[PDB]
Amino acid sequence: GADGVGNSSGNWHCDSTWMGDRVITTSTRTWALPTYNNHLYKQISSQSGASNDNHYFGYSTPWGYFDFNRFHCHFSPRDWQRLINNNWGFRPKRLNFKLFNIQVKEVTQNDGTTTIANNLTSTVQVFTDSEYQLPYVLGSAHQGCLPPFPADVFMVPQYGYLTLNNGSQAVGRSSFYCLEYFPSQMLRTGNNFTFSYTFEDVPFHSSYAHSQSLDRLMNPLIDQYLYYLSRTNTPSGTTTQSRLQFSQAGASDIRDQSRNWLPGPCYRQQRVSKTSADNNNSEYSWTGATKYHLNGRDSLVNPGPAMASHKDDEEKFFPQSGVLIFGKQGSEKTNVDIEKVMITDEEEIRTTNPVATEQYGSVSTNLQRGNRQAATADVNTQGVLPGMVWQDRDVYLQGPIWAKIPHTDGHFHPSPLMGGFGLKHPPPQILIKNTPVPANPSTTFSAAKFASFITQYSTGQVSVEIEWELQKENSKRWNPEIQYTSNYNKSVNVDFTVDTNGVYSEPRPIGTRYLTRNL
Amino acid sequence: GADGVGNSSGNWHCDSTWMGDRVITTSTRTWALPTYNNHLYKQISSQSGASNDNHYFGYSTPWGYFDFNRFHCHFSPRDWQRLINNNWGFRPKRLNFKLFNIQVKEVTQNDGTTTIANNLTSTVQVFTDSEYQLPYVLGSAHQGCLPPFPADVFMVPQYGYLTLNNGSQAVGRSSFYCLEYFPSQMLRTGNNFTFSYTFEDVPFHSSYAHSQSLDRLMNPLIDQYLYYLSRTNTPSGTTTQSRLQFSQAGASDIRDQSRNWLPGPCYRQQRVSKTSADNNNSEYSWTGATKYHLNGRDSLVNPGPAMASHKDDEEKFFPQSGVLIFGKQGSEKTNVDIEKVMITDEEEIRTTNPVATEQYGSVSTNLQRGNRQAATADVNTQGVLPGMVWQDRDVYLQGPIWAKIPHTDGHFHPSPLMGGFGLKHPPPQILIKNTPVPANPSTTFSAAKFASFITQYSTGQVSVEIEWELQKENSKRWNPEIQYTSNYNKSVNVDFTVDTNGVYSEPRPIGTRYLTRNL
């Protein structure tokens, strides 16, 4: 699209409509973009000394990108609630994007006095990496997505990436991608950039919780017909004499019943409690946390494989890195106290996946014989096994929406671990930069790189609309399901509202599983 | 096909052409075939005493088979190089085979003097087991495939197979397949045997190395928004008092960052070093090597599941059985010294799969509490887990090309472990035998089995052409990729050449990953 200077390049679309089966969440926000790295690509690396587990090598670019991989960039409390309360599941189908009403300003810091003014002509160029030839950054839970609250103006993030490294230094194989080596489209004012995408058949996120659970799944009333090993030894006057007898598992017997499927896999996490007291006093934050390691650098295992966060009656506990944790609007960056964060809870799964903090089961160790007692041992890490079945990490309104499946020789069940939809070809990276403006050059020629540009930034609005599909409920469940509600009682502030000084804020994390489906 | 005696049953096709997307490697070689087991099927078994882990039972047949399950039976250094240097990947599509110019000779060892002459009439019969009713031997890394070097004449291997066994003895279930119970086609001279095959949709072998790696994958510039557990206890005058605080992972924080996928699986191997010194002195060749075991016989775990062979800066090490090892042209059969072999290296993977010699990660053991320190333990064997992603063993010019997927109730990701393409219905076994020639029978009848045949063997050439598909490169990588080159400096002998006495020889193993794709 194209037009004039006194012509709005696009209108403001920010609705949300439900169609019974679909529902489209349109949404627009105003943004701003500075000139990063003063227009140059800069090489960047870990700090020489820095622990090995923390080295790196890569580049930062003068390019800034766009991102809305956060559910709340599309759903509004209320809306989300609608969804989350009457749908067995849902998934994204297609999207449409558009930047417009772009405007380029140029600040002038003459002595003690700045003065911003329109640089009409100068441009901002955009380009979408629709061929995925660029290090996909999104999906890395970074923060600089869209504001949950419309009215909020925002700054565009700067693109940076990482290649290979042998400590703080580069290794040859590492590649250096240059963003100008693409065909950016250049916008001036009166210019807009639209583009549209279509998702790929993915599974509806399961937005329901299970009423039955693996173990308790058969019918009480009837005993099976298969037998199991009831007792081993037997009374012989005073002493026992080994004599194995078997029984037919019934209701009273349950624990012993024969089955057909196994809980999901696991990778044991340390348990910490919301109650300061209980927790051993010391620094096992890193030392005790569950991790894995590549090329000799141990990394953390955050968002551990999807597994319930606490047994019955222990909402007080949680994994050291088995859950998602968001900050309460305002919460500072580092070492903030428990009271400043919102920890997610995944009890809803208990029913199928193991509890993060407790071992999977316990396999037998030795082979018993008359002169040898029967061994056994608990298992803290069980990789996928036939017959296992499980549930993936719920979603949360202010959580990630999707993530790119890495291009590898092999993947195994790609639901992104941080939760979300695992996409092979996700929404392409959208980039934006401000074509430089060489400030006054010298009369006599010089072949040096230009270094003195006009100080200036850009701004303008952006809009994103997405169509989601739904799987409606359908249970013959007689008694009421659970629903997500807002507290009745009076409060000094409404949830998901602007305070007295107009600061919007999300009180709690809102999950997705409320409706109840049987297993 | 058919014709006369003074008529070449086929010409010599040994080209190789590239078409941009495909590339066909035609190739012909001269061969020779003796008469095995003096024409009879012989029962064969382990040596009574022999360690249990080494028993067996099966048969050897008078039949010899054909095989080219080695990349170099089709690619010529140069060619291979072309491929390997400009292609994100490739795979086989179809093939065509033909035997021809068959000729049957008959030696005469009259006293101190042999004398070979043409037995025109007598025949050689061939037959392809296109229904896979015969124990698929190929794929077992046996040696008797085609000569890498054209000019080389070769001997055809003899077919043998193995069934069940209870120690050195047979067990009933074990089957005994007889090769005459097939409809062999009989060739006399002037007769040729052609046949063609078509591969099945398989995945292009990934012939590229990764520039990013699982851990270092997100964007440096921006800190995430999810929080993790920074510290546990806290300064209380003199003493620490447990007080968990959380942080928001950033660049400096990296190791702690939240992610979305896990390294490939693992099965720990012992580390040995190319440097004699380091290595503990003793015999842990078997005792210390990683293995598995069926029906009480521990077998070795060679070509362990695909996993990088050494961390940064340790090209000197390697798994005890985690790598492929070829002999330097000439190297004898047993206990040959390190200097006689070429060990393959799979560093290229590091980026996704674990290091063979070092544990996967480390899970937590106990549950900590005030009166209990936080436990933890390293894991040396991790079975596939959701979110895991990885790369398969590279290929190597003189490596296997494919392998038959065993007919079972269940397989899991069939890329053959020794590397190659996992095929459900691979190129059918091709067999060949020389119809016997009863040497002079007695005038008076006898119903005994004939035992005195004419001494004779066969020869003639064979040709195999195969069409491979390619996936061309396509990265916006600015700086040069790595390529495979031959050393500039002078040398007494060219690599992949015949020495002074015309002995062709492959200097080093050549992999496949050189081109660099991002993860």
Next chain:
Amino acid sequence: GADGVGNSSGNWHCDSTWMGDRVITTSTRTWALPTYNNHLYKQISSQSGASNDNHYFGYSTPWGYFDFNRFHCHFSPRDWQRLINNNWGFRPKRLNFKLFNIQVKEVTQNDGTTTIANNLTSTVQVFTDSEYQLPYVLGSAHQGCLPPFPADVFMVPQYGYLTLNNGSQAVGRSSFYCLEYFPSQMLRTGNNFTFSYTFEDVPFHSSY
């Protein structure tokens, strides 16, 4: 072309005719071919010490080649004379080649006594490097072309070539061409191999 065992795969053409403007010199000769390097490619180099101006590195092949880059393989004194006496100049235009009546024998040196006999089946394979992917040896004034005199039987030369070298040793850039990496056509007896060529506009040799 193809046929049987008791069938001459080609006749003997050895004429020479003048047409006023053209003149065609046909010519046939009998030849023989041993098995070189006992069937293998052998690496070959100057003699370590040997003056520098005389070092080299290259290979010898089990392959033998054909050659008639000598005017007398086509002209007969007399003929040549005709030409040479009444022509301001001349040049070649096209050619046609054919091998035939191929026969494979096999000697038997049993003790103090050899005995040659027909190995009917066995073959001889031929192939023309029509894409010039092989080190062009001919033109190097080598000797093993055709006999000037028809009646003369001859032996076929063996193919060998030279690459780069840093003294008596090889240098990487040097290439090693393998003759089997071509699609040889295989002849058995009763088999013939013909092929034809066409020269390119060249200047008449000034014969005045």
